[PDB]
Amino acid sequence: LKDLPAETPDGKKVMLAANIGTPKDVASALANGAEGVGLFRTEFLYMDRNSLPSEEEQFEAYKEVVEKMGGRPVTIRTLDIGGDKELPYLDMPKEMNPFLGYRAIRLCLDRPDIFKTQLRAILRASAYGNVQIMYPMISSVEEVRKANSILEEVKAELDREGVKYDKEIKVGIMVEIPSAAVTADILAKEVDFFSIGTNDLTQYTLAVDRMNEHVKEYYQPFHPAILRLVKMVIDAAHKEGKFAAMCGEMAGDPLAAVILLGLGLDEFSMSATSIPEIKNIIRNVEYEKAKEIAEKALNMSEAREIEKMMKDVIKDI
Amino acid sequence: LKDLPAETPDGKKVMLAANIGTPKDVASALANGAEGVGLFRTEFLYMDRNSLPSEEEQFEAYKEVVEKMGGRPVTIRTLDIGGDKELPYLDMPKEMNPFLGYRAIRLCLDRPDIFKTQLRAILRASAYGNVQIMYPMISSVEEVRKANSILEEVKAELDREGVKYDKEIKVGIMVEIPSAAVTADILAKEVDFFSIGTNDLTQYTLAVDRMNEHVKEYYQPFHPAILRLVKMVIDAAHKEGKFAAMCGEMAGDPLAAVILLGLGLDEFSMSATSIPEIKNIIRNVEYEKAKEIAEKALNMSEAREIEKMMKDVIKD
Ligand SMILES: [Mg+2]
Ligand SMILES: [Mg+2]
């Protein structure tokens, strides 16, 4: 049943959640047993249009998802877009390397008018259910503090207006810039949770644009560096009594599941149709064994060795 | 201070070397007391022309530098160029993010004809002085192996041709892709030395193109992540009994000098005119003190605070 938990035969439970891109994705997420939305991408509100999305428009979309998820947590990622999306109204610079450029939280900090509208909408939606905020493209704890300063300005304005919001709203970050993983210990003290964006973490850590056909082979999700950074983030979160999620494609990859379980990942967020397959793996591997396998993976020097091992593991299940 | 060693009062010596971009840079390097060339950039041979540089042309350039340096080590970096530099004859593709694309060692491995021509010229040049080879843009040990395999093929060619080269030639890598720093322990077993390219390490680690005016402030050389990766690379080299150099701009920065010293950096490579100032700092700070200062820096959370501290350290 989609209602059985992702729980090992020796009693370790993890959370399986859905990544969504619009409110229409909710039905499929629940049908597949999602326990929450680990990543609500908000780009849909900004794309394919000629004006900034109003607070009310954003609010209605966030509220719909929050309500339909019936108390399950909904982690909303703030604007994660750059000038490569070539959106007219946004009036963005042409850039030589947009992936390393003026995008996401950097755009939001430079344009707090835009950022405040979205934060207002999210905070208003939090009165209707279990909402979390997640900042993308964070390189440093200094940026988290800047972002939170704006969030607090918005909360104070809502207080003055008598507009309600969840005063206990949890605010975390995407860990995708390598510096955020390397300094996860510093960040863990000042965020409520981490969610690892392994797609971009892998690209930045290996300096590879995986959409570039000429270098696609250099995108290596099982590179030991990636496993090391993932472990570092998970351990840093736990040292501070906080949770570590992953919403990058890796979390929905059956080959990565046992390693992630063994490393102590708390929440796996993925395309909804991937949930049953990962749940089945978790329900059929002992946590004690998964820890041993993760340990073996961390001792390996090549991505292909880890992949060979993980293929053998899945075969055995 | 020219002929004076870069050595602390309590006896810790480091090597100060020059970064160069053309053989014409040698005189100034020597004038400022460079003990070697920590980075010979080879892009000049490929720029401003209608076809690839011949093996002979490359050879002549490398030979000149190696001889003029009179026995001092010359670390030659292999082709580091990407499609963002418009060199039509090169035929490199248009890319959305060239800094993360088909460039440097990736180009060389895909086009071994180009790579072999350069490697032959460097090897040939190594018969006339102290030459080292350094591969740029390495993300993994597997790439090092591939590059060395081509090097070995070239060595074999020269042997059959009875052409002379240094059999003991040292081969290392630039550490600038974050994965290479994170797995420096793996890489250290299979390279002869590291040189840290902090310019690009900082750009990749913080995901920032520092030439982008909208985000230039996100480029922060003293971010704790950069210091931690630098320490990791130095320690990894040392565990394998090997040396760690740095040729990024940080090595020439007076604010970084005491931290780098305290971390145990072996070689600082920089614009020639920066050498005297760095030497002066090293000669006027105790190694024991530098180690404490480095430890303090590595315990801090904010680049701005680290910079403040270092400004006070060298104020004297
Ligand atoms: Mg991302
Ligand atoms: Mg470089």
Automatic annotation (TrEMBL), chain B:
Keywords: Coiled coil, Cytoplasm, Kinase, Magnesium, Metal-binding, Phosphotransferase system, Sugar transport, Transferase, Transport. It catalyses: L-histidyl-[protein] + phosphoenolpyruvate = N(pros)-phospho-L-histidyl-[protein] + pyruvate. It is found in: Cytoplasm. Phosphoenolpyruvate binds at residues 41, 77, 199-200, 210. Its EC number is 2.7.3.9. One of its GO terms (biological process) is phosphoenolpyruvate-dependent sugar phosphotransferase system. The keyword RNA-binding does not apply. Pyruvate binds at residues 77, 199-200. It is an enzyme of class 2 (transferase). Its cofactor is Mg(2+). Mg(2+) binds at residues 176, 200. GO terms for cellular component: cytoplasm. One of its GO terms (molecular function) is metal ion binding. The keyword rRNA processing does not apply. General (non sugar-specific) component of the phosphoenolpyruvate-dependent sugar phosphotransferase system (sugar PTS). This major carbohydrate active-transport system catalyzes the phosphorylation of incoming sugar substrates concomitantly with their translocation across the cell membrane. Enzyme I transfers the phosphoryl group from phosphoenolpyruvate (PEP) to the phosphoryl carrier protein (HPr). Belongs to the PEP-utilizing enzyme family. This is Phosphoenolpyruvate-protein phosphotransferase. The gene is PtsA.
